[PDB]
Amino acid sequence: GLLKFIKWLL
Numbered sequence: 001g002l003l004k005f006i007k008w009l010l
């Protein structure tokens with residue numbers, strides 16, 4: 001979880 005949202009943010 002979580003990492004996918006950060007990959008979008010990046």
Ligand SMILES: CCCCCCCCCCCCOP(=O)([O-])OCC[N+](C)(C)C
Pocket residue numbers: 001
């Ligand atoms: C600054 C913070 C101080 C500490 C406060 C206490 C917070 C404790 C939070 C503990 C949360 C535990 O989540 P979990 O059971 O794995 O739910 C997620 C389940 N899935 C992966 C299936 C979506």
Ligand SMILES: CCCCCCCCCCCCOP(=O)([O-])OCC[N+](C)(C)C
Pocket residue numbers: none
């Ligand atoms: C704004 C204030 C924020 C404070 C944040 C404090 C965070 C404390 C984190 C404590 C360590 C939690 O490690 P964990 O659940 O085993 O991680 C790995 C999770 N998976 C196994 C699902 C990959």
Ligand SMILES: CCCCCCCCCCCCOP(=O)([O-])OCC[N+](C)(C)C
Pocket residue numbers: 001002005
């Ligand atoms: C993008 C990733 C998002 C992950 C979100 C994970 C959410 C985990 C939530 C875990 C909540 C389970 O504790 P609860 O029964 O409500 O605890 C009691 C709470 N009080 C002491 C304040 C009454």
Ligand SMILES: CCCCCCCCCCCCOP(=O)([O-])OCC[N+](C)(C)C
Pocket residue numbers: 002
């Ligand atoms: C990036 C985030 C990682 C997860 C960090 C842990 C978050 C834990 C939050 C738990 C908050 C519990 O509060 P409460 O008073 O029982 O509210 C209940 C609110 N609902 C009825 C809408 C569920």
Ligand SMILES: CCCCCCCCCCCCOP(=O)([O-])OCC[N+](C)(C)C
Pocket residue numbers: 003
């Ligand atoms: C404001 C201060 C900010 C400090 C921020 C510190 C960040 C620490 C990050 C610690 C990351 C630990 O990764 P890990 O559990 O081994 O990853 C497992 C990843 N997969 C599930 C994809 C394999």
Ligand SMILES: CCCCCCCCCCCCOP(=O)([O-])OCC[N+](C)(C)C
Pocket residue numbers: none
């Ligand atoms: C008040 C709310 C503030 C929230 C602040 C959130 C900070 C999040 C920082 C997340 C940093 C994640 O690092 P990472 O790549 O998994 O680290 C492991 C490094 N290697 C890949 C080289 C092993």
Ligand SMILES: CCCCCCCCCCCCOP(=O)([O-])OCC[N+](C)(C)C
Pocket residue numbers: none
């Ligand atoms: C105890 C520590 C303080 C409380 C921290 C609580 C953090 C909980 C984070 C929960 C994040 C849930 O993401 P969500 O709405 O499903 O994502 C948006 C999805 N769409 C883009 C498709 C609309």
Ligand SMILES: CCCCCCCCCCCCOP(=O)([O-])OCC[N+](C)(C)C
Pocket residue numbers: 006010
């Ligand atoms: C008001 C509160 C604001 C809090 C804001 C927190 C933001 C946290 C951002 C965390 C970013 C983590 O980056 P990373 O995974 O190491 O990037 C890797 C990127 N490349 C693969 C291209 C090298």
Ligand SMILES: CCCCCCCCCCCCOP(=O)([O-])OCC[N+](C)(C)C
Pocket residue numbers: 008009010
């Ligand atoms: C505790 C304080 C919480 C503050 C919460 C602030 C909420 C408002 C965040 C608004 C963020 C807007 O980003 P955006 O232009 O859609 O990003 C797109 C990013 N890429 C171009 C890399 C895809």
Ligand SMILES: CCCCCCCCCCCCOP(=O)([O-])OCC[N+](C)(C)C
Pocket residue numbers: 009010
């Ligand atoms: C602090 C400003 C917050 C507001 C940002 C608004 C969205 C702008 C558009 C998205 C910008 C994406 O940048 P990034 O690929 O992650 O850049 C990383 C650059 N360094 C490798 C040099 C650290």
